[PDB]
Every structure is written in structure tokens, then in C-alpha cells.
């Protein structure tokens, strides 16, 4: 995250780190949606242009973390993957449409002060909150700028941007399964995700029921925090049919 700040303890207890075993590194962000299911961006796991093709056994899920690099004994919980499910119409070739994947954990994770699932929106939540100007929150352990790495989990709040403005910022084809967020050049505030933040959550706090909802998945940007560019997020509600289907089936 660029131009964000250190997370408070327990602020984002659904944040998950995808951690590569060999070599030991940050692969991506993700989020906890129940005691056995973790949501992330497809391209964190599968992306042929960068020769990314991770199998279950290549990765661990680390939950309840705050520090980027420390083993947070008896705070974080580390889980093994049972199975990865990538959206079958994930479009890596063109625009990262349907940049979404699920992971089932081998065993259920115990909830705690530091570990707690985020809510998934329903149609009405999306209609209410996913409006230009409305701010959400993006969290992660990715880089502090485009070209270094934080000691602890980083947060930034960012406004959803008008669809035409998103489109006019990029040469890439933007779909209805994506939204964009970030400040405009004039605004006097800035901030973005950056390398290592992909797959993490864009969350909003419902003012109707005081619960946090994951409205987006960190997907892509042209660089990080550049004037005139925005972040593109997977629209969770639009892919919820798919989410429900994977979880109902498996």
C-alpha cells in the first residue's frame, strides 16, 4: 500500500497472507470468509504471462497477522490448502475480468480477537454502498511505492470512482465485473495498492447494520499511486453466484 498508514491491532481480522513455502516470500493478500474458505485474486495463483501456476502444496495461508515478517506465535494461525478453485471465465489474457479464486483450508481455523471473517454483500448491500464518492478500505503488506516494504499491515481509505472516469484512465477494457477506486489529481489526498497487495480486500462498513462487507478484491493498476490512474477491483457481489456455487458444491 502506497501512502497508507499502519493498521491498528485487530483492525482487519479477516486479512490473510498467502505465503510461498519455497522460496519463503509474500505471494499475495486474501481474506477470510468463513472458518474454511479464503477469497483471493485468480492472478495470485495463475498467471501464465509471469509463469505463475501455484498448486495447493506450494502455499500456506497465514491468518491473524500484523507484522509482515515475524512468526506471530500464539496470534497468527497458519493453514494448509485443501483445494484451489479459480473462476472458469477468469480472463488473464485481456483485462483480468473475473480476477477471483477461492481456497478451501484443510482444517477449520479458530476465531479470536485477531481472526474473524468478513461479510460478503448481497444485492441490496451492493446497490447501497457501491456508489461514486463512497469510500472503502484497502489493506495489505505490499510495497510502499512503485519502485520499500512495510514492517506491519498497511491501510488506506479510497473513494469509489465514476465508471466513465475509470474507463477514460486506461486503454484496457473495463467490465461490469470491475470497479475502480482512488483519488483524482486535484484532490489533495492520494493512495493505492501496490505489488504484493493483490487479492486482498476492499471493504466498506455498512451504516445500516454496522458490519464490514468485502465489496472488492485488489486486482490491478498501471503502476501504483500514479496521478490520473486508479486501482481496479473485482466486484464481489457480481461474482457471488459463482462463490455460492463453489461453496455449496464443495
Amino acid at each position: 500500500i502506497v501512502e497508507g498508514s499502519d493498521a491498528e491491532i485487530g483492525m482487519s481480522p479477516w486479512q490473510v497472507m498467502l505465503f510461498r513455502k519455497s522460496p519463503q516470500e509474500l505471494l499475495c493478500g486474501a481474506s477470510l470468509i468463513s472458518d474454511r474458505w479464503v477469497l483471493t485474486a485468480a492472478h495470485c495463483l495463475l498467471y501464465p504471462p509471469w509463469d505463475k501456476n501455484f498448486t495447493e502444496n506450494d502455499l500456506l495461508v497465514r491468518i491473524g497477522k500484523h507484522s509482515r515478517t515475524r512468526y506471530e506465535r500464539n496470534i497468527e494461525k497458519i493453514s494448509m490448502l485443501e483445494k484451489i478453485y479459480i473462476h472458469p471465465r477468469y480472463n488473464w489474457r485481456e483485462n483480468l475480468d473475473r480476477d477471483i479464486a477461492l481456497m478451501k483450508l484443510k482444517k477449520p481455523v479458530a476465531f479470536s480477537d485477531y481472526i474473524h471473517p468478513v461479510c460478503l454483500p448481497d444485492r441490496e448491500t451492493a446497490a447501497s454502498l457501491l456508489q461514486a464518492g463512497y469510500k472503502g478500505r484497502v489493506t495489505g503488506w505490499g510495497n510502499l511505492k512503485e519502485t520499500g516494504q512495510p514492517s506491519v499491515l498497511q491501510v488506506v481509505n479510497l473513494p469509489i470512482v465514476e465508471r466513465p472516469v475509470c474507463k477514460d484512465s486506461t486503454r484496457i477494457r473495463i467490465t461490469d465485473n470491475m470497479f475502480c477506486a482512488g483519488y483524482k489529481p486535484d484532490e489533495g489526498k492520494r493512495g493505492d495498492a501496490c505489488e504484493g497487495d493483490s487479492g486482498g480486500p476492499f471493504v466498506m462498513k455498512s451504516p445500516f447494520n454496522n458490519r464490514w462487507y468485502q465489496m472488492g478484491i485488489v486486482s490491478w493498476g498501471e503502476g501504483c499511486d500514479r496521478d490520473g490512474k486508479y486501482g481496479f477491483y473485482t466486484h464481489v457481489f457480481r461474482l457471488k453466484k459463482w462463490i455460492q456455487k463453489v461453496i455449496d458444491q464443495f
Binding site: 491498528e8 474473524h116 481509505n157 464490514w212
Partner: peptide, 27 residues
């Protein structure tokens, strides 16, 4: 049923430092 009500925040009626910026954006 308990999704995302944070044990160290909503569960104790404490607000984090910037959630009010989110609220003030919701018209």
C-alpha cells in the same frame, strides 16, 4: 451470523481511527 463484527472494535463499541471518514462519505 457474526461476520464482520470485529472483536476489538464493533464487539466492544470502540471505533478505529479512520472508519468515521468512511461513514462521512456515505450520503
Amino acid at each position: 451470523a457474526d461476520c464482520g463484527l470485529r472483536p476489538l472494535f464493533e464487539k466492544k463499541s470502540l471505533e478505529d481511527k479512520t472508519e468515521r471518514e468512511l461513514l462521512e462519505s456515505y450520503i
